[PDB]
Nucleic acid binder design. Structure first.
Ligand SMILES: [Mg+2]
Ligand SMILES: [Mg+2]
Ligand SMILES: [Mg+2]
Ligand SMILES: [Mg+2]
Ligand SMILES: [Mg+2]
Ligand SMILES: [Mg+2]
Ligand SMILES: [Mg+2]
Ligand SMILES: [Mg+2]
Ligand SMILES: [Mg+2]
Ligand SMILES: [Mg+2]
Ligand SMILES: [Mg+2]
Ligand SMILES: [Mg+2]
Ligand SMILES: [Mg+2]
Ligand SMILES: [Mg+2]
Ligand SMILES: [Mg+2]
Ligand SMILES: [Mg+2]
Ligand SMILES: [Mg+2]
Ligand SMILES: [Mg+2]
Ligand SMILES: [Mg+2]
Ligand SMILES: [Mg+2]
Ligand SMILES: [Mg+2]
Lengths: 135, 177
RNA sequence: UGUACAACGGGGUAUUGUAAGCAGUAGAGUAGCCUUGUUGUUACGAUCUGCUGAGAUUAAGCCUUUGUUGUCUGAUUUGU
RNA sequence: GAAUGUUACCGCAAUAGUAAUUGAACUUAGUACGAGAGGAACAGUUCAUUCGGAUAAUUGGUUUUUGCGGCUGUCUGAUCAGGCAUUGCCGCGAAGCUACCAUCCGCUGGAUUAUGGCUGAACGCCUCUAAGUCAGAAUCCAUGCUAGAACGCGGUGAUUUC
RNA sequence: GCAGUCAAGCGUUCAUAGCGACAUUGCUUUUUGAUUCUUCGAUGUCGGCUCUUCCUAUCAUACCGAAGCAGAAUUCGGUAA
RNA sequence: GUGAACAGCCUCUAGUUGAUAGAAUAAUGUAGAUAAGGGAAGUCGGCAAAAUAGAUCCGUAACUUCGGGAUAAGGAUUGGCUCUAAGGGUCGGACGAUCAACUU
RNA sequence: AUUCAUAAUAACUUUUCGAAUCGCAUGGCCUUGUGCUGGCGAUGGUUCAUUCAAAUUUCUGCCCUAUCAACUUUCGAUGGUAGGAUAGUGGCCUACCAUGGUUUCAACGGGUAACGGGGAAUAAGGGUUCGAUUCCGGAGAGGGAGCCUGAGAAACGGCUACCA
RNA sequence: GAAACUGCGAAUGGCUCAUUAAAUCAGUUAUCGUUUAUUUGAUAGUUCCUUUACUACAUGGUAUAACUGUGGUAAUUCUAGA
């Protein structure tokens, strides 16, 4: 069972209470009693009628509890595999400290330094062929 | 309704089915992003915390963060937004969309786990799922490994093995910047 | 002479829609006077804002009540 | 409301009154019947019409709550706060009253009529009828409902010193 | 105005399912006449409105019997106000 | 005073406060009001009631004896406050001094 | 023909642009750092010009109609000033002010089975009739209005509303 | 090399003749009255800062599609949570 709210006064409407208007467009309006109903019919503006939720909001009457309510939290956790990387490859990789990196590194870094100058002499090779390669 | 639960630490996900108005009802008037303590919804999820993220009503309309409302409304939508992918430059469409406030009119709630509960959920905590693609731009490789503008990438790029049958190969990105 | 009754007062419930008083570099402006304006002041000014969902009313056929105050044997008849 | 000793409480029930009404939909069923066209009903379900008896949670009407506020004209030197204008006028307005304009409630047994029958003579056959008898209606009689005979009545309490 | 008796006829055939000529017996007193008993020292016209009650020659509703009642619809009739 | 006003409403001077009284607030009345939705279906008949209404500005048909019809009809506006502008008199030679109103 | 092009002074700016881009080649030059250099061309970029446009705009020219004679300023009608708005002139709009503007040389109103033109048909000449329709211009996407995107649309094989 | 991002185009074309009578349209003018993607030609040594203990330039930031996975609706080139 639902408590509707008065669409002029913001008042709680319990089952059976008040009335429900259905306008031409089809905007539904609900009033809690015949006072809000009437003020609505007179084309009053809730924002200028002081007892309403709407006026009270537009005039910062009340609040105070909301300017007090601040903070609260809680968060987080850990790690999942990646397919082609079990948590173990991930432990193994992550763990190993710089001196093995530099090691690994400067090895390969020397290892293909060889490949480079090797392919280079390979160029001059198919070229002292191609500045020869006769009849 | 059906719950769509994601464990975004592992990259896992599974669905769950709740019948029982009282077990559900914990989610009512809760909005997108609100947290929900687990035990209320079940004994399995005891302790578990859920941050609500969206989901669909019957008739399938997606929720849209920020509307408020526990109903459906039709909005003009634009480039760069939820529940709309524009067909043409500067096209906008007026489309039905569901409010961001949970009601029993939903076929599916979409939750993301924020804190793990006291017990394991099988397809979610037990299983763990590899991040499809690795860093491609230079300095993102530098960051995903912590490196210094000294270390040289090339041998830090990822290397994905895939087989021709009796010829197993090795493909890496193509570093940029 | 009471777990009495009444008059008041108090609290609740209602109705209306924000009292009086004070204050305001709130206010279309006009007009005086000066030391002539890093806020000049004086007169007048509907209205506006705050204190203020305030104030007023609320059993007369609303509900309640640890308070205050008072009341508590006049008249007439009747018998197998 | 006098008089039946006085006064009180609880009751009986003679007599008189008496009340409910009608429709539709779903289902039965596209069925029984029918060449087709068409096309029911009983049981069960949900509603409605006309009537009646109450009731006021709710909604609505009423407003001297002259309860709160707003307004014109005048009067009290001004202010505050008030008077007068046959209730000055306007908006809201509690309570009370009140509306198929609101809500709730409106009982179930018997005996019969018509009629259809059972047994059965008269008349060795026949026959619902003569004797006897079954079923049976918005009927009638009760149940129920309203008064309660002021010359109908029962059970009970207390019955005078000034 | 209303209801009977006879049954020639209607009703494809078949008097009487429903009807019914020629004749004929009645009933009613919301028709209209006929009369002139009461009232001309007074009994206040027509219609409507409102409200109660009664009649039954029953339009609806309850239960029935008939049919030229297959069904549906009708029509005749009974107990019924 | 309000206002067009010898209207209505309130006041001063003057004059009254006199037309049995008390207690209640049933029906039915007489006089005064209001009613949701519908809108004359009521009725011989809109009988009775209701609705309109002042002023300013707009606008205004047929017909006509050319005078009318006509407030036809149909519309907007209207408080309070604070300002702006315009509208006179008298006296000294295009000004100058002085006095005084309200109205638009 | 200019308060033109261009430049100088003082400041101003939620500061526009001034290459964090891509492809091919790999070469010179030493104090040998992978040093410092370096070829061809792509896409960009500000302002000016050019080209493709666009928008307004001067002069003259339209069918029938008086059984249409006065028309124009409700609620801009004609002009002045200032502003706002526009890509920009302009009553385009707004304030203030004035009383203008058109008309028998036919205004204004009505009609059109009216899109305009290049053109067509009919052949003495003068004419008469026609042109929805192969090219040019204009307008529209059932009717109205509104607008997003964008260099450009008041777009409809775009959206938005209302009406049918 | 799919998908998707990004860029460009969809304002051209085609169709119709409803409106429209000083409107459009034609010939003729004007921009010293403006906007102009593109094409073509040109055009940028200045950007930081109380101005020696410097400011990534050997090049600074995240957020997203497609995708993966979990979903909703009878239903659309609907789309949500992760
Ligand atoms: Mg790149
Ligand atoms: Mg790059
Ligand atoms: Mg080199
Ligand atoms: Mg370019
Ligand atoms: Mg001008
Ligand atoms: Mg301009
Ligand atoms: Mg004039
Ligand atoms: Mg003139
Ligand atoms: Mg002429
Ligand atoms: Mg045409
Ligand atoms: Mg043409
Ligand atoms: Mg033509
Ligand atoms: Mg045509
Ligand atoms: Mg042109
Ligand atoms: Mg069409
Ligand atoms: Mg369009
Ligand atoms: Mg089309
Ligand atoms: Mg098109
Ligand atoms: Mg229309
Ligand atoms: Mg694209
Ligand atoms: Mg971000």
């Amino acid at each position: 069972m639902k408590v509707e709210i008065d669409s002029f006064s913001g008042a709680k409407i319990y089952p059976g209470r008040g009335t429900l208007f259905v306008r031409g467009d089809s905007k539904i309006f609900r009033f809690q009693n015949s006072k809000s109903a009437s003020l609505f019919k007179q084309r009053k503006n809730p924002r200028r009628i002081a007892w309403t939720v709407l006026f009270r909001k537009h005039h910062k009457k009340g609040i105070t509890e909301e300017v007090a309510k601040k903070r609260s939290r809680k968060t987080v956790k850990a790690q999942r595999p990646i397919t082609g990387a079990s948590l173990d490859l991930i432990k193994e990789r992550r763990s190993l400290k710089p001196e093995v990196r530099k090691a690994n590194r400067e090895e390969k870094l020397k290892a293909n330094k060889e490949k480079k100058k090797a392919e280079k002499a390979a160029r001059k090779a198919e070229k002292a062929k191609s500045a020869g390669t006769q009849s | 309704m059906k719950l769509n639960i994601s464990y975004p630490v592992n990259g896992s996900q599974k669905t769950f089915e709740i019948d029982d108005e009282h077990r559900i009802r914990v989610f009512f008037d809760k909005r997108i992003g609100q947290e929900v303590d687990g035990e209320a919804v079940g004994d399995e999820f005891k302790g578990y915390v859920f941050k609500i993220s969206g989901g669909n009503d019957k008739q399938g309309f997606p929720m849209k963060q920020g509307v408020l409302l526990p109903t459906r409304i039709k909005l003009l939508l634009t480039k760069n937004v939820s529940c709309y992918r524009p067909r043409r430059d500067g096209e906008r469409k007026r489309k039905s969309v569901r409010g961001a406030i949970v009601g029993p009119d939903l076929a599916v709630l979409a939750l993301v786990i924020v804190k793990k509960g006291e017990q394991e959920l099988e397809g979610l905590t037990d299983t763990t799922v590899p991040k499809r693609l690795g860093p491609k731009r230079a300095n993102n490789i530098r960051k995903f490994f912590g490196l210094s503008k000294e270390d040289d990438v090339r041998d830090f790029v990822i290397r994905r093995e895939v087989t021709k049958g009796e010829k197993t190969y090795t493909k890496a990105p193509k570093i940029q910047r």
